Amino acid sequence: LHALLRDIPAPDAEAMARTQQHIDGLLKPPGSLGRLETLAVQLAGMPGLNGTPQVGEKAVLVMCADHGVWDEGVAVSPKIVTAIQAANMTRGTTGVCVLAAQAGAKVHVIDVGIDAEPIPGVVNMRVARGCGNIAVGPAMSRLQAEALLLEVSRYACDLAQRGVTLFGVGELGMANTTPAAAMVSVFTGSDAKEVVGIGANLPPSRIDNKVDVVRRAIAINQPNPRDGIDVLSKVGGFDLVGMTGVMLGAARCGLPVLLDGFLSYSAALAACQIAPAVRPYLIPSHFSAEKGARIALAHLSMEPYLHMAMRLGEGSGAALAMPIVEAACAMFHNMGELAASNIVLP
Amino acid sequence: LHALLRDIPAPDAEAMARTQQHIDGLLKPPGSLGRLETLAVQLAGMPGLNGTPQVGEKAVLVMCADHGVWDEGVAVSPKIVTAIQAANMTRGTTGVCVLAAQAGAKVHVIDVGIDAEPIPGVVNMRVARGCGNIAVGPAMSRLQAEALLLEVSRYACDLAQRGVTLFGVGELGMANTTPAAAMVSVFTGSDAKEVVGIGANLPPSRIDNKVDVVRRAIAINQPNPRDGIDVLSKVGGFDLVGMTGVMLGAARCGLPVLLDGFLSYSAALAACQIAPAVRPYLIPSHFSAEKGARIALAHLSMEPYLHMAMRLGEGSGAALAMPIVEAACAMFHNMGELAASNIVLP
Numbered sequence A, B: 001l002h003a004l005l006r007d008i009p010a011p012d013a014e015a016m017a018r019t020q021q022h023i024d025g026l027l028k029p030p031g032s033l034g035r036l037e038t039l040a041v042q043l044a045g046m047p048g049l050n051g052t053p054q055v056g057e058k059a060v061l062v063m064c065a066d067h068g069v070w071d072e073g074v075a076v077s078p079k080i081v082t083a084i085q086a087a088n089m090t091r092g093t094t095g096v097c098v099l100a101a102q103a104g105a106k107v108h109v110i111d112v113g114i115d116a117e118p119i120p121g122v123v124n125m126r127v128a129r130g131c132g133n134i135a136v137g138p139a140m141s142r143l144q145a146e147a148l149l150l151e152v153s154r155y156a157c158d159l160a161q162r163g164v165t166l167f168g169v170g171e172l173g174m175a176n177t178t179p180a181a182a183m184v185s186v187f188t189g190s191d192a193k194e195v196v197g198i199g200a201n202l203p204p205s206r207i208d209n210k211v212d213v214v215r216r217a218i219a220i221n222q223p224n225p226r227d228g229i230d231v232l233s234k235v236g237g238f239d240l241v242g243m244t245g246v247m248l249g250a251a252r253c254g255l256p257v258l259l260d261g262f263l264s265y266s267a268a269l270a271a272c273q274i275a276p277a278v279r280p281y282l283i284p285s286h287f288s289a290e291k292g293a294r295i296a297l298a299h300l301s302m303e304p305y306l307h308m309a310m311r312l313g314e315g316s317g318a319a320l321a322m323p324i325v326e327a328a329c330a331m332f333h334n335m336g337e338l339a340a341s342n343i344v345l346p
């Protein structure tokens, strides 16, 4: 793990310079394609991409797990929905499934801690049947967090070996916006009231309790904001840790990762805290409708491309942004050149 | 034309209610897919779509034309670039071409007034070789505007007959951000300084002249803000009128139209002024980096989905948003149902 972290490659400035020069000579006024241009250059700098903005196979990894904090009345959906939805993932009827098929990406459902019997078709990496209730103690042990980070990391890079060049991250876990809000509060220094949202339609009257739960979690655990692994283990969850692991793994592999929504922002904060070298590999997707979204993004210094008022999770926003990434590649490789048209601009 | 305007269909509230009900029962917390849900319902209400969110063939119509106002020093690119780029459109090397191919849409290049010899492969609907310099008079006659609106309108609907269900609108015309800014100022009541941008990299020092040009255009022509056709003819251009015609034509055909950037906003304002019934058929794409973008969008009451800092035009932003439209359809038709999973949420 320390090894893994040590081995994350820095971006290729040379490839990026070459990329920038090419883009400037394309059939358009310079810089006119805006973020589509900056995205291509960012991609060019990723060592796993071979010096150019390229997209091979795509995969969305969905990390599923239950949380003990559910018992605190912070979620309106029955606990079983995690298990139910996880099986549905295997049938291609879910939101991420539909959107992924649309983008030509494959969905990988991973069980990191669902509180139910094992589901056939789902990759088994279960840590335990649900994590501990953060309100009264820690979600898990440090050891547990570390081992899962490692395991997911390797799984992520192994995919690279099979042609995957673009990843998307997602989750499934009733009550997960609670630990997400806690982490956000911790890493960001924001008060719980400011980053606690409605999650999956929590009634406005139940909010206050959710806020109390977050503060309690923090107070009791005393997580260290300067230690990403400490925070994850204490007030995180298996699903959030898994998402963080995807991030570490893509980075180590020198490949890009598309974030999703609020839960993913949580995970991204942790990843970046753990290894700043991870940052350059991250790509925002959409601007989640969760209250704490603005604050989290500001701390990541990220401006998402899509404003869809989305708040489903599952990696649905990540799937939706995949075509944008492919567009930046299409622009780069298939547009003609000014010179070839004898076009001269000041 | 009055006929045409009269015959624009109102949206199907019945189909929309049915759509809403279906969406609510899908495998997710209600309303969780945000704008993706509102988009599907909007589509369902369009009579040309047959009571459901559907996407058949896609086409982007690019309206090309030169402007006399170029002579005022409001554009840094040589005049010939319009003609040059228009031919390139026929070779598939341009920005819209690349992005359209990416989205599986076909590009239709239409010459509505390029100041050069006719270009083989380009649809000929040329009004004149460039429009009049708005700084000293009108761009064209009312008759001319009306005839072009009509002609483009019919062409647009005819495509519908050939399987096209989704349109995108675009343009090509050096100096076109000038008449665009003028129209915006007129329809919106904003001062020229507030809506005049850098267009295709106009140097910050040249701005002031561009602003003076806009005011002069307005002062001299005295366009009537309550008469969209009056405004277009006076301080518009053949390209902008053509874009407006696409809009009128899709609406008459009861089909959706994706806007592009700043130039398209101009055209949309005019279209809506001319026929409010057009509004429900319009779909924003991206948030153009042109200064006057915020003001124009506010007047259309539109919030774009994409924030890419784009400012190329050609209908490139429209092509980029096509997959989003297709996603809303995919969601609608392929997601599973809560009921089928025995999932019950309050």
Ligand SMILES: Cc1cc2ncn([C@H]3O[C@H](COP(=O)(O)O)[C@@H](O)[C@H]3O)c2cc1C
Pocket: A074, A075, A076, A077, A081, A085, A171, A172, A173, A174, A175, A176, A177, A178, A198, A199, A200, A201, A202, A312, A313, A314, B027, B028, B029, B343, B345
């Ligand atoms: C049917 C259904 C499908 C979902 N897919 C993702 N979520 C989302 O809702 C949960 C977070 O919200 P909270 O913290 O309020 O539980 C996670 O499962 C998240 O993925 C879903 C939720 C439901 C009910």
Ligand SMILES: Cc1cc2ncn([C@H]3O[C@H](COP(=O)(O)O)[C@@H](O)[C@H]3O)c2cc1C
Pocket: A027, A028, A029, A343, A345, B074, B075, B076, B077, B081, B085, B171, B172, B173, B174, B175, B176, B177, B178, B198, B199, B200, B201, B202, B312, B313, B314
């Ligand atoms: C090579 C080239 C390709 C383009 N494609 C679109 N535009 C854009 O630039 C023009 C508007 O900017 P202004 O008002 O400053 O001229 C239009 O042609 C618009 O389509 C282009 C401009 C250039 C130079």
Ligand SMILES: O=C(O)c1cccnc1
Pocket: A177, A198, A199, A200, A260, A261, A262, A263, A264, A288, A289, A290, A310, A311, A312, A313, A314
């Ligand atoms: O932003 C998300 O991904 C999200 C928000 C609320 C509930 N589930 C997921």
Ligand SMILES: O=C(O)c1cccnc1
Pocket: B177, B198, B199, B200, B260, B261, B262, B263, B264, B288, B289, B290, B310, B311, B312, B313, B314
């Ligand atoms: O927003 C646009 O479409 C645009 C902006 C500047 C120049 N050309 C096009």
